Amino acid sequence: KPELTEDQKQEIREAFDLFDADGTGTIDIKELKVAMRALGFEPKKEEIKKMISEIDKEGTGKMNFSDFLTVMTQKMSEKDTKEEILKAFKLFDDDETGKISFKNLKRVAKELGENLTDEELQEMIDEADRDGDGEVNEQEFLRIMKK
Amino acid sequence: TALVCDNGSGLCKAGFAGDDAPRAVFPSIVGRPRHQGVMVGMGQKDSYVGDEAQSKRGILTLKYPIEHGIITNWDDMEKIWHHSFYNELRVAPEEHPTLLTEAPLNPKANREKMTQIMFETFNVPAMYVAIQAVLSLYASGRTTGIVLDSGDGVTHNVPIYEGYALPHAIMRLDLAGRDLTDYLMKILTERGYSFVTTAEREIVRDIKEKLCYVALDFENEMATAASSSSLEKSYELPDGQVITIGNERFRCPETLFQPSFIGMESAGIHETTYNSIMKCDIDIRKDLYANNVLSGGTTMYPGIADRMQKEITALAPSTMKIKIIAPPERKYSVWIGGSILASLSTFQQMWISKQEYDEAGPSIVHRKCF
Amino acid sequence: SMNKINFDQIVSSNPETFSYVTLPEKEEEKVPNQGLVSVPEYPFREQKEDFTFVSLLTRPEVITALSKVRAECNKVTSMSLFHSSLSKYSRLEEFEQIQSQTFSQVQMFLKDSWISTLKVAMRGSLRDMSKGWYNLYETNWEVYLMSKLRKLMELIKYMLQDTLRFLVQDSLGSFTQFIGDACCSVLECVDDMDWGEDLVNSPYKPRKNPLFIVDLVLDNSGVHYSTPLEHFEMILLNLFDKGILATHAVPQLEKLVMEDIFISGDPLLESVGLHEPLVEELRANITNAMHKAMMPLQAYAKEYRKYL
Amino acid sequence: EIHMTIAAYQTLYESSVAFGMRKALQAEQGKSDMERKITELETEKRDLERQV
């Protein structure tokens, strides 16, 4: 079942509370849509009314924080079209080789902040290098990650 | 619309709610003309109150109302409020809900009496009570804070948590601006300026505002002052005599940390605040270390923020980010808090009000209020 | 007043015709250059906004709840954990009965009556606060800890603990002072000194009527009262235990106040313990009071021991 | 603006005299409570006479 870290919850909390200083603990579904497109996704009116139907049987027009968080978690959870996968690899690779060197991974790790060890990084490289060429192509990245 | 009136014992402040500053300020003094038969012959009003009373201070009688932060006489305080409303505020008091403020731990009877006098005599339909530190934290803008407050007649520390005061950890210390003026007067007398009259004493107060500042490393500062004239700062009295002050400028503030100079034995303000948070609970201790906020006149002295930061850190375990904050307007900040508080529409729903005031009446200031 | 303004106009107009008369005074005003006092610039609008954002006071329902629990405390704070009042002397067993009864009564009152009352009253007010931070109908411990609601509840916990702490202190202090007013007369002066032989006469008297009534028996190699007094000292220390421990047993508010999820491992409230120094020194004082007062009974028995 | 200003001045006077007699009448009620105090204490002096 989808989950995200307590620090991710804290960040989402700051997002919610800045989204309106009015301290209501509930905010407009329209602003939820503005949030999603600020993340980079502009869902269509069918998805707008679908999510509204989730949030607001009563029709306040408002998520509470737990709805905001749970719908965020779900929309975070699913798989993307290839464009976003390419974006991911292009950020992972700034050697511009189409290869995730161990350097590329290690910098991405230092950027995100999780301190996972060098053998663990090299092992997820090794399994992610689905063709075993020495590191992971964007092809090999696709091949593992689409699974 | 709403009114806010406040008394850090030293001076009292009168303002319209939501304004970024109060509309008048005037000093916490009342005076009656010494021959009542002359007054009734004149029709000249019951009392001079506020600064014009000072202008006449010698021609009449003068008295203080809120000594050590506590009501010495109700009738005087109501005369203060009357003068405030008509002379400063002009509004009809009957037409504007009104906020009045008190020192903490006020003996229960005083709250009830104060309510009764305001509601019944002044005839406003609704009124609310607040404890000064609580409003000053509102001005700082936290529900979660340990406040230092010092209006020239008293000083307190107050922990407040999510908008309530944990009573037992409150402490009083009877060491405030008046005491500081008296100690400064003593030590200048040792220099040989020998201020004693009320007028001179006011001059001393002005010197406190002009030239005091805390030392950091007090013993080092004192040594450097002894070493050289370069620390001197000079001032000229209203009579045109020039007076010169060294070590004394920071030495006088030291009494706050160093009450043995006053010959009183409770540990200095920093210690008292530490001991208060020690009365508070480790659960909330971290946030208390996170928000140390300074309130009231004595905070006027330059640099005190750094001195507190050091001395608290030393007395604290060296395992938190201590943070002093000295909001620039900190003495007014008590009133600023009330102004914003009353501005909050929901407080209209908090209002104690005439209909309740009959049956629920005097007791609800205990029962309903905070 | 109308005639005043007429008079002032007239005298202004024709001074010489009645020059002996004075004018009234004349006075001036200078516009305070701002109608508000100086108070150098600060983010007043931003501070106000921040205060509105953080605070919990934007919700009259929680106001009604909190004021209600305050009222409950406000009768609670003037209850007593002990019968700090007795009409006249009493025998030991009656002390034990009436104090143990008092303790049981207050324990039932707190655990059943006070907690249930405050819980249902606040719930009733909370009931109709709908979705938002204040949601009774919480479904995640994490979000509850995130919420203002938990912080408010923890403040309720703080207030009701604080109040019962005051009740404990005021009961203990009053009770000890009440014993003190009886014992202090004998506490002044004993030092193993025998009160005399004036069998009808005693210097040791309570300021009021005595606490205790005492039965005297005379025996082969004995003069003694009732049971040797220390048995009373221990029992009264246990009376302290019964009352102070009675403070502990208040169920932690969270588990009754919030129902819509599992919570367990619930504590009690905190209460003032048995070793907070002010209580320990009251226990010392009452130890002195009884132990020393028992000695003049020795002195009186000493003179009876010849008649024995 | 000046019309409102004069209206305010009138309102001020009206309420100020309102305070003035409201003090006078509150004090007159206080004197009525004096009448109560003396009358009831006179009945208590009758009670003290009965007690002697």
Swiss-Prot record, chain A:
Source species, domain of life: Eukaryota
GO molecular function, one term: calcium ion binding
Lineage: Eukaryota, Metazoa, Chordata, Craniata, Vertebrata
Expression tissues: Ubiquitously expressed in all adult tissues tested, with strongest expression in brain, spleen, kidney, small intestine and ovary. Also expressed in the NIH 3T3 fibroblast cell line and peripheral blood lymphocytes.
Subunit structure: Monomer. Homooligomer. Interacts with CCP110, SFI1. Component of the XPC complex composed of XPC, RAD23B and CETN2. Component of the nuclear pore complex (NPC)-associated TREX-2 complex (transcription and export complex 2), composed of at least GANP, 2 copies of ENY2, PCID2, SEM1/DSS1, and either centrin CETN2 or centrin CETN3. The TREX-2 complex also associates with ALYREF/ALY and with the nucleoporin NUP153. Interacts with USP49. Forms a microtubule-associated complex with POC5, POC1B and FAM161A. Interacts with CCDC15.
A Pfam family assignment: EF-hand_7
Name of the featured protein: Centrin-2
Domain EF-hand, chain residue ranges per copy: 7-42, 43-78, 80-115, 116-147
Residues the record lists as Phosphothreonine modifications: T5
Residues given in the record as Ca(2+) 2 binding sites: D129, D131, D133, E135, E140
Localization, UniProt: Cytoplasm, Cytoskeleton, Microtubule organizing center, Centrosome; Cytoplasm, Cytoskeleton, Microtubule organizing center, Centrosome, Centriole; Nucleus; Nucleus envelope
UniProtKB/Swiss-Prot annotation, chain B:
Keywords: Acetylation, ATP-binding, Cytoplasm, Cytoskeleton, Hydrolase, Methylation, Muscle protein, Nucleotide-binding, Oxidation
Residues with the Methionine (R)-sulfoxide modification: M39, M42
Expression across tissues: Expressed in the liver (at protein level).
Induction: Induced by S.japonicum egg-mediated liver fibrosis at the site of egg granulomas; expression peakes at 12 weeks post infection with expression decreasing thereafter.
Reaction(s) this enzyme catalyzes, per UniProt: ATP + H2O = ADP + phosphate + H(+)
Subcellular location as annotated: Cytoplasm, Cytoskeleton
Pfam families: Actin
An individual GO BP term: mesenchyme migration
Catalytic class of the enzyme: hydrolase
Extra facts: In vertebrates 3 main groups of actin isoforms, alpha, beta and gamma have been identified. The alpha actins are found in muscle tissues and are a major constituent of the contractile apparatus. The beta and gamma actins coexist in most cell types as components of the cytoskeleton and as mediators of internal cell motility.
Function statement: Actins are highly conserved proteins that are involved in various types of cell motility and are ubiquitously expressed in all eukaryotic cells.
Quaternary structure (record): Polymerization of globular actin (G-actin) leads to a structural filament (F-actin) in the form of a two-stranded helix. Each actin can bind to 4 others.
PANTHER family according to UniProt: ACTIN
UniProt-recorded name of the protein: Actin, aortic smooth muscle
Gene designation: Acta2
Curated annotation (Swiss-Prot), chain C:
Compartments, as annotated in UniProt: Cytoplasm, Cytoskeleton, Cilium axoneme; Cell projection, Cilium, Flagellum
Summary of the knockout phenotype: Mice are viable and show no malformations; however, homozygous males are infertile, due to inability of spermatozoa to move from the uterus into the oviduct. Spermatozoa show decreased motility. In addition, tracheal beating frequency is reduced.
UniProt signal peptide: none
Recorded family membership: Belongs to the dynein heavy chain family.
Function field: Force generating protein of cilia required for sperm flagellum motility. Produces force towards the minus ends of microtubules. Dynein has ATPase activity; the force-producing power stroke is thought to occur on release of ADP. Required in spermatozoa for the formation of the inner dynein arms and biogenesis of the axoneme.
Subunit structure: Consists of at least two heavy chains and a number of intermediate and light chains.
Protein name: Dynein axonemal heavy chain 1
Gene of this entry: Dnah1
From Swiss-Prot, chain D:
GO terms under cellular component: 9+2 motile cilium; axoneme; ciliary base; cilium; cytoplasm; dynein axonemal particle; dynein complex; filopodium
Listed GO biological process terms: cilium movement; sperm flagellum assembly
Superkingdom field: Eukaryota
Annotated localization: Cell projection, Cilium; Cell projection, Cilium, Flagellum; Dynein axonemal particle; Cytoplasm
Gene ablation phenotype (knockout): CRISPR-mediated knockout results in loss of sperm motility and fibrous sheath abnormalities with asymmetrical distribution of flagellar proteins in a majority of sperm. Nearly half of the knockout mice develop enlarged heads and hydrocephaly.
One Gene Ontology term of the molecular function aspect: dynein heavy chain binding
Signal peptide per UniProt: none
Predominant location category: other
Keywords assigned by UniProt, alphabetized: Cell projection, Cilium, Coiled coil, Cytoplasm, Dynein, Flagellum, Motor protein
Tissue specificity statement from the Swiss-Prot or TrEMBL entry: Predominantly expressed in the testis, also detected at lower levels in several tissues expressing cilia. Strongly expressed in elongating spermatid cells (at protein level).
Protein purpose: Involved in sperm flagellum assembly.
Similarity comment: family membership: Belongs to the inner dynein arm light chain family.
Subunit field text: Interacts with CFAP45. Interacts with DYNC1H1.
Protein name per Swiss-Prot or TrEMBL: Axonemal dynein light intermediate polypeptide 1
Positions spanned in the full protein: 156 to 207 of 258
